[PDB]
């Protein structure tokens with residue numbers, strides 16, 4: 002029928018991370034407490050339900066700056082943003098809770114499920 | 124060390140295709156002869172060298188409409204655009220040449236290589 | 246007698262999906278909770294009994310907007326809409342139930358039967 | 368990965384033929400010489416390049432009546448219309464030429480190729 | 490003596506199906522539950538004993554609309570109507586019973602006999 | 612796939628001939644010189660191009676009486692009418708010419724072709 | 734001495750069938766259950782012993798309507814009536830018994846003998 | 856398919872001759888000069904074109920007495936009437952001309968043709 006490229010998706014994500022690192026076409030600024038994170042809206046929606054709900058709304062599509070609640074832990078967010086573009090989650094006993102709570106706020110069900118298995122195994 | 128998500132990249136690409144189908148955050152219009160194709164700039168760069176060279180240039184970053192040469196075969200382009208978001212390439216004896224030529228124009232080396240293996244095996 | 250084209254139907258469905266992706270002649274908008282899905286009435290009737298019962302009625306034939314119950318899970322619907330145009334069903338343990346319930350609401354007996362075999366085998 | 372439905376496409380085409388027979392959602396009238404044929408625009412585009420080129424144009428999308436050249440043989444057209452919805456082509460020595468010429472006008476490359484093999488074998 | 494045309498009857502039936510598809514001289518409307526089916530009275534009598542008994546009666550000859558019992562399964566009827574004009578019966582495990590029961594109601598002894606052999610072999 | 616009934620079409624034609632013999636639902640009177648022939652419009656169209664062209668016209672659909680040119684030989688017409696309902700053509704050296712000429716007038720190409728082969732072999 | 738016409742009798746029977754089909758000089762109506770059959774008294778006597786015994790009687794000669802017992806199967810009678818005028822008997826496993834019984838009632842010894850050989854060979 | 860009775864037609868004609876000899880159901884009187892001949896209308900039409908043209912007319916159907924022109928030779932007529940019921944023509948040099956002329960008047964083309972071959976061979 003057709004031909005399946007097993008590593009295509011990983012190559013795409015890698016190139017997207019390269020563009021993000023170089024600030025190419027990063028159309029949104031995420032403000033967490035005092036920190037700023039530039040990212041691509043499409044990747045945020047693809048990996049986050051909260052960002053999906055926000056950017057799906059035509060009233061918040063064109064929003065250049067997204068101000069999250071100051072309560073969200075920056076370490077939970079930046080670890081998760083790196084994971085979103087790399088698929089590698091830096092989960093350790095010192096940040097597991099901040100990450101789990103942030104994944105809950107960002108509606109990353111599979112991430113929360115893995116934080117649940119993490120403290121279940123540890 | 125860390126945990127590898129084998130199917131994360133495919134889930135990301137699938138959600139990106141869902142956004143494209145729903146016209147969510149599609150910031151560019153590709154004009155091929157008389158046809159129009161809305162897509163995401165980041166995915167185009169991630170999968171195409173030509174689009175990478177174009178959108179890497181700060182002069183052509185913010186271009187909302189990209190007019191390709193009218194010589195480019197639309198079937199080669201739309202099959203390739205679907206493959207870019209799905210990783211499945213609809214290559215058949217009736218379109219192999221249009222696809223190979225378009226992949227050459229779009230600088231999709233692995234696609235051209237597979238078109239080479241296709242007619243080599245057929 | 247005559248000549249059977251084994252791959253004709255798949256080529257037809259593929260071209261129909263290409264038109265849907267390009268919003269060509271999509272005459273209906275399906276409203277699920279807050280999401281909108283544009284599709285072709287004929288394909289919906291061809292693959293769904295509920296849509297068949299609706300569009301068969303001359304009172305609901307010309308309805309441009311179909312508002313489904315807000316209870317229907319969007320993931321069940323969009324996975325099923327893609328399957329309707331592609332014949333490929335993305336059934337995984339995380340969405341099997343939403344899909345089974347939606348196929349029941351949409352009256353997709355063979356889909357419900359396959360969801361039954363899925364959890365029977367898993 | 369996923370589950371392939373080998374007979375789904377045939378069931379879809381069969382239901383589409385059932386709707387056409389019952390005049391359900393047939394949005395176009397094809398006028399060939401003195402004869403009228405009601406069909407679905409999406410199926411016509413899916414199986415015909417000429418109808419694809421016509422209905423792809425936004426100026427001819429909403430055309431309810433398509434007047435073909437009076438030179439087109441009705442037997443070539445109706446045999447082909449039935450084949451489009453059934454995948455069964457009624458090709459016999461008495462109509463092969465009218466069908467081949469009509470498939471050429473309708474841009475049905477695989478049909479013309481089969482008419483070529485027909486007189487090549489007969 | 491004379492000359493036998495082996496394929497004449499099939500050509501006649503095919504042309505009759507073409508007229509039915511084009512609604513030419515279809516003088517009767519069959520109402521099954523909420524569905525309507527236009528057909529030719531002569532073909533119905535030729536293939537059905539029930540319709541023979543009905544249309545043989547001079548009181549029900551000129552009846553333009555025939556209302557069958559709402560209990561008759563539409564899939565059994567439409568599959569059988571297509572078979573009546575095509576000689577091809579779409580009998581599968583999912584509809585065998587509806588077809589057998591409808592053939593019994595329509596008095597299609599050979600069809601019922603084949604439904605008997607179907608479940609006997611399956 | 613499905614089941615082919617090799618003798619269904621012959622059984623249908625036989626029952627149609629039985630109805631014609633019993634004057635059941637014969638909706639048209641064919642006037643040839645001084646003779647009258649009652650037949651079914653659908654069978655006439657199915658077997659004759661002239662009757663197809665006539666009854667296809669909505670102006671001549673509902674015509675209860677069809678007056679043919681008085682020049683048409685009645686033996687050519689009645690032999691052909693019997694053949695139309697029986698598939699058996701009574702072609703002999705004494706009537707071959709009247710039949711060939713009538714088949715030409717009625718546009719029965721295969722009949723004319725067989726009259727051509729008849730005098731070619733005799 | 735004289736000249737024997739081998740095919741005269743068949744030509745006579747054929748013309749008699751043509752008159753019967755056109756209702757010319759058919760002086761009797763045979764009522765079988767709810768069905769009516771118009772035929773010629775002379776042919777009935779020539780081929781049937783029962784009709785011979787009836788029409789030989791001067792009391793039943795001029796009877797315009799002959800009411801047979803409602804028990805006689807119409808398929809046995811009409812197949813036999815066609816055979817009487819055509820010499821071709823449509824004997825199949827589905828009607829052999831109705832025909833044999835009717836030939837017995839009509840006193841068609843050679844027909845009953847052939848029904849005996851039929852089930853003897855089958 | 857079916858079974859052909861080679862001698863059925865001769866047995867029918869023989870029984871018809873037996874009825875004529877016994878004056879059973881002879882519904883017409885043919886008056887030739889001073890002679891009277893009782894026969895069956897159906898046999899006359901079956902073997903004679905003149906009688907066919909006469910009895911086909913509804914005005915002359917029910918005529919109990921048919922007065923032929925007094926010029927018609929009785930020997931030509933009675934020889935022909937016997938031949939009509941027996942298929943044996945008593946043609947001898949002393950009556951050939953009266954028979955040929957009568958067959959011409961009665962429109963018995965094959966009889967006239969045989970009278971032509973008779974004097975051609977003698």
Ligand SMILES: CNC(=O)COc1cc2cc(Nc3nc(N4C[C@H](C)C[C@H](C)C4)ncc3Cl)ccc2n(C)c1=O
Nearest residue numbers: 046047049050053108109110111112138141319320323
């Ligand atoms: C390891 N990965 C994870 O943990 C991510 O899991 C999740 C991902 C996720 C993605 C999105 N983004 C989109 N969602 C849709 N759709 C709406 C979905 C509810 C159903 C689907 C049919 C369409 N379309 C387009 C985007 Cl970009 C929305 C919500 C999401 N939620 C709630 C998740 O739990």
Ligand SMILES: CNC(=O)COc1cc2cc(Nc3nc(N4C[C@H](C)C[C@H](C)C4)ncc3Cl)ccc2n(C)c1=O
Nearest residue numbers: 016017019020168169170171172175230231232233234
């Ligand atoms: C099955 N897949 C294929 O066939 C695709 O193969 C190809 C993909 C491809 C991707 C891009 N896109 C980006 N390229 C970079 N970089 C510049 C590259 C030359 C080297 C890399 C280090 C950075 N950054 C960011 C994007 Cl989005 C550019 C050119 C490409 N060419 C030439 C390919 O042949």
Ligand SMILES: CNC(=O)COc1cc2cc(Nc3nc(N4C[C@H](C)C[C@H](C)C4)ncc3Cl)ccc2n(C)c1=O
Nearest residue numbers: 290291292293294297352353354355356382385564567
């Ligand atoms: C993998 N595929 C599946 O699971 C789909 O299975 C089903 C498909 C399905 C399709 C339709 N659509 C039409 N149905 C008719 N007819 C009415 C049918 C009940 C019988 C048929 C004779 C005509 N006509 C025209 C359309 Cl477009 C209606 C109901 C359906 N139901 C209930 C299914 O369960």
Ligand SMILES: CNC(=O)COc1cc2cc(Nc3nc(N4C[C@H](C)C[C@H](C)C4)ncc3Cl)ccc2n(C)c1=O
Nearest residue numbers: 198201202260263412413415416419474475476477478
């Ligand atoms: C047995 N089957 C055959 O013989 C049919 O073969 C053919 C089918 C055919 C179908 C269409 N219809 C569509 N075509 C596109 N695309 C444009 C194509 C040139 C390339 C493709 C990528 C998109 N999109 C959507 C529809 Cl509905 C257009 C032209 C076609 N031509 C030229 C064929 O020769």
Ligand SMILES: CNC(=O)COc1cc2cc(Nc3nc(N4C[C@H](C)C[C@H](C)C4)ncc3Cl)ccc2n(C)c1=O
Nearest residue numbers: 534535536537538541596597598599600626629808811
């Ligand atoms: C694959 N085909 C099947 O399964 C169809 O089998 C059957 C066909 C069928 C046809 C008709 N239609 C006519 N029947 C007569 N006659 C009355 C018959 C009982 C006997 C016959 C001599 C005349 N005349 C004119 C028509 Cl149009 C009536 C009843 C029938 N029954 C009961 C069947 O079982």
Ligand SMILES: CNC(=O)COc1cc2cc(Nc3nc(N4C[C@H](C)C[C@H](C)C4)ncc3Cl)ccc2n(C)c1=O
Nearest residue numbers: 442445504507656657658659660663718719720721722
């Ligand atoms: C042994 N048989 C023969 O010799 C009969 O051959 C012929 C049969 C014949 C039948 C019809 N009747 C119909 N014709 C159509 N169509 C229009 C046709 C030209 C093409 C077809 C696609 C639709 N539809 C519905 C009827 Cl009822 C019209 C013309 C015909 N001509 C010209 C023949 O030469």
Ligand SMILES: CNC(=O)COc1cc2cc(Nc3nc(N4C[C@H](C)C[C@H](C)C4)ncc3Cl)ccc2n(C)c1=O
Nearest residue numbers: 778779780781782785840841842843844870871873874
């Ligand atoms: C294939 N053909 C068969 O199966 C038909 O076989 C039969 C034909 C048959 C015909 C008639 N009809 C006439 N019978 C006489 N005669 C009285 C006969 C008993 C003897 C004969 C000398 C005169 N005269 C005038 C007519 Cl129209 C009477 C009875 C018949 N019986 C009993 C048959 O079994």
Ligand SMILES: CNC(=O)COc1cc2cc(Nc3nc(N4C[C@H](C)C[C@H](C)C4)ncc3Cl)ccc2n(C)c1=O
Nearest residue numbers: 686689748751900901902903904907962963964965966
């Ligand atoms: C050895 N035999 C001969 O020589 C007899 O040949 C002839 C027999 C003959 C029979 C009849 N009788 C019928 N003719 C028709 N039809 C009208 C015919 C012209 C054509 C036919 C289709 C129907 N129907 C019903 C009867 Cl009973 C009429 C005219 C005939 N002519 C002109 C003959 O030359």
